[PDB]
Amino acid sequence: KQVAGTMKLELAQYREVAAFALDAATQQLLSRGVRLTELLKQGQYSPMAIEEQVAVIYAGVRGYLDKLEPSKITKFENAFLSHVISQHQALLGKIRTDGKISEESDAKLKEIVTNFLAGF
Amino acid sequence: LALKTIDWVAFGEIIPRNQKAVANSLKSWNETLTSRLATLPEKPPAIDWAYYKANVAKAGLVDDFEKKFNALKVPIPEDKYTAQVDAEEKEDVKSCAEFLTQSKTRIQEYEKELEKMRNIIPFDQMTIEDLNEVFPETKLDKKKYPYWPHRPIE
Amino acid sequence: IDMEKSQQALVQKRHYLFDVQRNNIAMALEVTYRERLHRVYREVKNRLDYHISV
């Protein structure tokens, strides 16, 4: 809920304006919406645990992808999952058990996303 | 089984441009083969030998095959690339000696120049010979332009 | 002077490239190992299974 209410509002705003392709806010809405659309694609027979969806949409909405090209957003996603599922299983278990993103969990996820994106 | 950890952000800043794209291809090999590790489980399962045999008519053949399978052990493939350790050492001596000692000596130079330039006598207290010794590049070159004013008027 | 210091630190950190190369080689061989194991196990599985089929 925390992660996706923002995405719902942002997608709403993006849809409201996508009928033509000016200012900083408008272009920001277009770019964020395109990133989120690229983020929501998925592959067949590839379901994702709830925590994994939370992590991906978090990295998408809070704004840690606005510089990466939209075409790469899919590839990023893949690689990111590989890292998250490999090293920080403790954080994902914390999210799953306590079905909520606490402030400390939010900070740990933030630093994880920033660090991973650094390697690009 | 143990692999060292890499921080690509710093590692990027090390490649000479001449051998750069090859290094990017190497990186690509790395990610491909990292994934192709991650995919397949750690160890192939076994077989329900006794139950299976109960499911077979030619059971003795099943026991024969199981035994021989137990006998065969996959040849342990080998390393041939301590030569990369050789590269470790060679580039070690190369970079260390040349770059890292030319560094110390060149630093000694630039240090002495800085000392000089910090304690240049104030110009008010200074004659033209002083400047010609200080910035030799303002020498009037009394041999290539021996006649006055030794610098073309332009 | 500062550029010299910085490139000296770069030289210090140099080893990462060679280390990545070794990592690649090593676990390349390792997962070759594991796939050969899979290969033998799967092959014997198939060989024994085409008798249960009959």
Swiss-Prot record, chain A:
It comes from the Eukaryota. The modification N6-acetyllysine is found at K1, K8, K67, K75, K100, K108, K110. Acetylated on lysine residues. BLOC1S1 is required for acetylation. It is found in: Mitochondrion inner membrane; Cell membrane. Signal peptide: none annotated. The modification N6-succinyllysine is found at K1, K67, K75, K100, K108. Heart muscle (at protein level). Heart and liver. ATP binds at Q42, Q44. Subunit alpha, of the mitochondrial membrane ATP synthase complex (F(1)F(0) ATP synthase or Complex V) that produces ATP from ADP in the presence of a proton gradient across the membrane which is generated by electron transport complexes of the respiratory chain. ATP synthase complex consist of a soluble F(1) head domain - the catalytic core - and a membrane F(1) domain - the membrane proton channel. These two domains are linked by a central stalk rotating inside the F(1) region and a stationary peripheral stalk. The siderophore enterobactin (Ent) produced by enteric bacteria binds Fe(3+) and helps bacteria scavenge iron ions from the environment. As a consequence, the mammalian siderocalin LCN2 plays an important role in defense against bacterial infections by sequestering iron bound to microbial siderophores. LCN2 can also bind iron bound to endogenous or nutrient-derived iron chelators and plays an important role in cellular iron homeostasis. Belongs to the ATPase alpha/beta chains family. Homotrimer. Component of the ATP synthase complex composed at least of ATP5F1A/subunit alpha, ATP5F1B/subunit beta, ATP5MC1/subunit c (homooctomer), MT-ATP6/subunit a, MT-ATP8/subunit 8, ATP5ME/subunit e, ATP5MF/subunit f, ATP5MG/subunit g, ATP5MK/subunit k, ATP5MJ/subunit j, ATP5F1C/subunit gamma, ATP5F1D/subunit delta, ATP5F1E/subunit epsilon, ATP5PF/subunit F6, ATP5PB/subunit b, ATP5PD/subunit d, ATP5PO/subunit OSCP.
Curated annotation (Swiss-Prot), chain B:
Belongs to the ATPase d subunit family. The modification N6-succinyllysine is found at K73, K80, K90, K139, K144. GO terms for molecular function: proton-transporting ATP synthase activity, rotational mechanism. The modification N6-acetyllysine is found at K27, K43, K58, K67, K73, K80, K90, K112, K139, K144. GO terms for biological process: proton motive force-driven ATP synthesis; proton motive force-driven mitochondrial ATP synthesis. Keywords: Acetylation, CF(0), Hydrogen ion transport, Ion transport, Membrane, Mitochondrion, Mitochondrion inner membrane, Transport. Subunit d, of the mitochondrial membrane ATP synthase complex (F(1)F(0) ATP synthase or Complex V) that produces ATP from ADP in the presence of a proton gradient across the membrane which is generated by electron transport complexes of the respiratory chain. ATP synthase complex consist of a soluble F(1) head domain - the catalytic core - and a membrane F(1) domain - the membrane proton channel. These two domains are linked by a central stalk rotating inside the F(1) region and a stationary peripheral stalk. This is ATP synthase peripheral stalk subunit d, mitochondrial. It is found in: Mitochondrion; Mitochondrion inner membrane. Pfam families: Mt_ATP-synt_D. Component of the ATP synthase complex composed at least of ATP5F1A/subunit alpha, ATP5F1B/subunit beta, ATP5MC1/subunit c (homooctomer), MT-ATP6/subunit a, MT-ATP8/subunit 8, ATP5ME/subunit e, ATP5MF/subunit f, ATP5MG/subunit g, ATP5MK/subunit k, ATP5MJ/subunit j, ATP5F1C/subunit gamma, ATP5F1D/subunit delta, ATP5F1E/subunit epsilon, ATP5PF/subunit F6, ATP5PB/subunit b, ATP5PD/subunit d, ATP5PO/subunit OSCP. The gene is ATP5PD. InterPro entries: ATP_synth_F0_dsu_mt, ATP_synth_F0_dsu_sf_mt. One of its GO terms (cellular component) is mitochondrion.
From Swiss-Prot, chain C:
It is found in: Mitochondrion; Mitochondrion inner membrane. The modification N6-acetyllysine is found at K5, K13. The keyword Metal-binding does not apply. GO terms for molecular function: proton transmembrane transporter activity. This is ATP synthase peripheral stalk subunit b, mitochondrial. Keywords: Acetylation, CF(0), Hydrogen ion transport, Ion transport, Membrane, Mitochondrion, Mitochondrion inner membrane, Transit peptide, Transport. The chain holds residues 150 to 203 of 256 of the full protein. One of its GO terms (cellular component) is mitochondrial inner membrane. Component of the ATP synthase complex composed at least of ATP5F1A/subunit alpha, ATP5F1B/subunit beta, ATP5MC1/subunit c (homooctomer), MT-ATP6/subunit a, MT-ATP8/subunit 8, ATP5ME/subunit e, ATP5MF/subunit f, ATP5MG/subunit g, ATP5MK/subunit k, ATP5MJ/subunit j, ATP5F1C/subunit gamma, ATP5F1D/subunit delta, ATP5F1E/subunit epsilon, ATP5PF/subunit F6, ATP5PB/subunit b, ATP5PD/subunit d, ATP5PO/subunit OSCP. Subunit b, of the mitochondrial membrane ATP synthase complex (F(1)F(0) ATP synthase or Complex V) that produces ATP from ADP in the presence of a proton gradient across the membrane which is generated by electron transport complexes of the respiratory chain. ATP synthase complex consist of a soluble F(1) head domain - the catalytic core - and a membrane F(1) domain - the membrane proton channel. These two domains are linked by a central stalk rotating inside the F(1) region and a stationary peripheral stalk. Belongs to the eukaryotic ATPase B chain family. The keyword Phosphoprotein does not apply. GO terms for biological process: proton motive force-driven ATP synthesis.
